[PDB]
Amino acid sequence: GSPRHTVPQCCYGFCIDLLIKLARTMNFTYEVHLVADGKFGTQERVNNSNKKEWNGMMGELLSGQADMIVAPLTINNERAQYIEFSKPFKYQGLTILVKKSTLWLLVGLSVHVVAVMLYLLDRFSPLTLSSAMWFSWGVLLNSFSARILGMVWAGFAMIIVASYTANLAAFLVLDRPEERITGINDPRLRNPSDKFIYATVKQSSVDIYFRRQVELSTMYRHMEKHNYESAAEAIQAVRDNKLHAFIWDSAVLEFEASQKCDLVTTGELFFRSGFGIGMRKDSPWKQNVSLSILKSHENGFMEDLDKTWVRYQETLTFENMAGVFMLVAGGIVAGIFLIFIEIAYK
Amino acid sequence: KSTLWLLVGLSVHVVAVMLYLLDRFSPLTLSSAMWFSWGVLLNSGIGFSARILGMVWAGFAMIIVASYTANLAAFLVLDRPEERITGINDPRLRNPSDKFIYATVKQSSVDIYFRRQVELSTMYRHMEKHNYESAAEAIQAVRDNKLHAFIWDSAVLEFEASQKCDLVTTGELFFRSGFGIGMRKDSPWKQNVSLSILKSHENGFMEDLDKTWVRYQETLTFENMAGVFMLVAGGIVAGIFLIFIEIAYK
Amino acid sequence: NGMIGEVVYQRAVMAVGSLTINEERSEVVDFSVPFVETGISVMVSASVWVMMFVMLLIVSAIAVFVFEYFSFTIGKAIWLLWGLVFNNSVPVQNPKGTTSKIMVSVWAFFAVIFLASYTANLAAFMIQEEFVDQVTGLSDKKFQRPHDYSPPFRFGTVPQGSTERNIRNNYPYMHQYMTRFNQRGVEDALVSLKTGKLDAFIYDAAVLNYKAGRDEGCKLVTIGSGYIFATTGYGIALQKGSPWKRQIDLALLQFVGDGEMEELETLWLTGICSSQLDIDNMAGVFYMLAAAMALSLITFIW
Amino acid sequence: NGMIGEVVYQRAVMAVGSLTINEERSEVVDFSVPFVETGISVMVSASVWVMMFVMLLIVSAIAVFVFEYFSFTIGKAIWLLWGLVFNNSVPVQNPKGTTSKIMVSVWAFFAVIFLASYTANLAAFMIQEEFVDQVTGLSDKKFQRPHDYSPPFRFGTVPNGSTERNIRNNYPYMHQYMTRFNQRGVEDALVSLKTGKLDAFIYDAAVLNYKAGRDEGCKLVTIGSGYIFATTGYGIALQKGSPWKRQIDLALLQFVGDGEMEELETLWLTGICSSQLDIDNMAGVFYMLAAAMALSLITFIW
């Protein structure tokens, strides 16, 4: 994305203020900079000489270009196998980001038949015609021999509106499409397809964590299709539903849910680990940093930084009666037209 | 395998009298207008701003009765008495209690199967104080609710479920094994009959044996409102007794 | 052919892979103890009325007693009775007796609790969703003539397998009906069940059970749970007179006795798992309106 | 003394058992990496009415217009209309105009579907399981003083513990108030919370989570899951300068990223766990009817 553009800029935030804090703790200076290319770093062969290397922040750390990684690095096994880690300052896991009549008209034709047959039943065996018509108006919605079948139809009308109340409460209350995934334990994602598009950040710790486990191998052959550079591109791709799910940490997705109310996490939570500080080998800057982080944990300064960024956040009945509402608003014109008919007839 | 309604009743007994007083103050009248208020909080039953208060009271009628439709949906529809165990993965049997009476035949295959599995040691502590000798004694004891669970093969339990409705099994199925023929040592009858057993499996003779014994098995709304039904059937005598009191007045 | 020929011609020592067991295979080679329940499988896609009648007679008799007490409350008050059940706002009668007002208040509270309990009844009936299978078993009326029902449908198997041989042991005519309905692949038959190219399919139990577990959307539904089926079991194929038979049998039956086989079944097998339709209630509506016009035709004689 | 006294003074090699991590321990020992998130914890036991009112005025205006076509129900049509919204059917009036009858029938259909949607709204409100937290963090004003609020309550800790040292290094006045409210046993505080001899309790997170996950009835629920809290971890304590640190840490981090740690969490932790009440809505009912009779007493001035 950059032909040649490398500038100084203003950087701030959570780990920046943590860096200012332990810079206040013991006295030292520093040089804050960023990575050349936006990767955490994975153990990967370069395809000349058949040799493993690291890239990203770890590739700049081991090459001497960097000496301390104050950044959200995910502690796992293999990254601890080469360098030393302090105790983690943030504890979280992993989760998934997603984006979160006809027969009545037949009964109306039936009562159009019923009103005619009841008036003919009253006509055969002994303003009255309009009286029985207005009786049919009062019966078909429910706002002596024919009145027996009329009250039978009133029982029909109550049992029909009872079934209508029951299945509307069904359709919008009880049953529900499974919008949730139930986490990593979804059997449909075990053998996925083009309808479940989900992946991870390219060369992140999620890649190694899903490359290790043998019961998650098939998804690893699917999530290698859409590996993304930044998490912002993942938010952008799920934002237009080009994806269908995303695998990322807890507090970052909770902050994005506080940003955007449609970006919603899911129920499950696995891989309980912690963001710590990426450090070098045996160095005199090892015990001091862990003691200072633990001193920041024992007081509420971690909770103060939560108040800065982590804790910091940012029916009505018009759904199926919207068309009914428009029909009620439009029927006033038909009633005025019937007033025109009643004027023009006399 | 009530009180709030009484408070609403005393409330409307206040409401009808004070609304009739307010309608007299804002111009057999008393009993007829009280019966009109009876028709207000109920259906019609009988043939100026105080009526506005009355129609406001009409709204409260719905927020009674729809609420009466609401709470029974919390009382019988969604809730359920926890009478299921859902198989071996219940921590109630993993961490037992004094009333969780589960056992089997003493010195059966279930006992060795739970004695080998050391993670099932805890249930092995229970049944040694609780096991029986025959499964029919276990059926008789669980009919009198002296048992509370019974680890057993599925055929006998599903057959007794077809016998009696209260005998209810569960869903999980562990140690999926086979019932076969116990044989002696090296003998040709280990071979011949085995093919004969397979000769029974290839045709529908096992299906016919299932039809003889295995496959062949053997709303109303009166849960707790039957007392209200008895109240409706019995209040007629007291009502007509009050009508005889009204005769004694007239 | 395949594995059995490699065992008989002894270029294969044993066939540990998944293998059905029937009579002629048990004749030509020797098997192990079973380890999984794998048969075959088929894949497809009163008094209340009496007591309310009694209470209606009670209310009518008390209405007669109201008319004898203290103006058409003789027998037409039932038009008030079964009209105030439903709250239709239709004018019926203005009662002039205190007995009538108290009895109609009791009946109104009874109708309120009856409609509330009927909403609860509709909720409990809506939660109870039907799950039926039209084909009962291998002796189906569909399995004798598909044109006896109005669509003549089709159902297939895998070719040249032990399932076809067991069908030919059961019925050669079933094989004659199935001969024009053969196909090639397992997932080919799966997609044919998806896009309507095939209606039912017959194979072994656990394979179609797992394919129903991985069915995207619980769409294709099995029939039964292993009741009307062949009920055989997978084993381990060994040569006749091989010394490894008893050791493999004891090792397998040791592997059953710790739940490790159940753990492998948990790992590799996952058999998981609303609109306006009241056709039973509408059929009752049509039957009661037919009874209503029949009663009107009875009353037309006067 | 204790675990630290046995580790530092070289009568043991490592501390495998459950133990917190704080500053002076990290001075005297060198901990491993943590493996379970175990901080600290505290255990205890709008637009419908306006537009519907405007449509009500529209219906009343059309009733006035039907009177202009054609008895005294000019302003009394509202007492018909909003009285028949709820369908309790107060006897009001029988309309004469045909367009008025069609309008009343359409509005009655709207009222029937409105009450059906209101029953569905009550069912959807009945779906949700709401939780309450009378104390929402360690920085509560209730914890500042039991005289600040009207019931003087109590809160328990454990003696000679790391939680007491964290309180003494973070909140000395809270340690002064905890000095009044000390006790000894964990199960003693459990029985005091069940019977009611204790109100609050302050300890680590996962221990109280496991005590809540195995109790019958599940009265004791925490406050969140460790969000306004210390948020540290349990690990393994070793001697300063032991060569086992790297190997133990690599073995633990291998045990994390395979689900085997999750399997042990399944093995040793349990993840289990109303009536008719509307008295808030009832108090709203009584207060709105008192406001309505107050409005009637205001209108009585003429």
Ligand SMILES: *[C@@H]1O[C@H](CO)[C@@H](O)[C@H](O)[C@H]1NC(C)=O
């Ligand atoms: C700060 O730096 C000065 C000069 O190097 C040094 O004397 C002092 O000890 C430092 N403060 C601490 C305690 O780190």
Ligand SMILES: *[C@@H]1O[C@H](CO)[C@@H](O)[C@H](O)[C@H]1NC(C)=O
């Ligand atoms: C592998 O080697 C080729 C040689 O042309 C080169 O493209 C690159 O170093 C490697 N592949 C990639 C990442 O394109």
Ligand SMILES: *[C@@H]1O[C@H](CO)[C@@H](O)[C@H](O)[C@H]1NC(C)=O
């Ligand atoms: C913190 O830093 C100083 C720097 O010399 C060093 O002595 C030690 O690592 C830490 N403090 C102590 C324990 O002196």
Ligand SMILES: *[C@@H]1O[C@H](CO)[C@@H](O)[C@H](O)[C@H]1NC(C)=O
């Ligand atoms: C079955 O028993 C008969 C008894 O004569 C014997 O001939 C045969 O060996 C047995 N089965 C076979 C076919 O091996």
Ligand SMILES: *[C@@H]1O[C@H](CO)[C@@H](O)[C@H](O)[C@H]1NC(C)=O
């Ligand atoms: C705490 O330590 C002191 C040391 O003397 C001891 O007396 C006291 O009983 C201890 N309390 C408990 C129960 O931890």
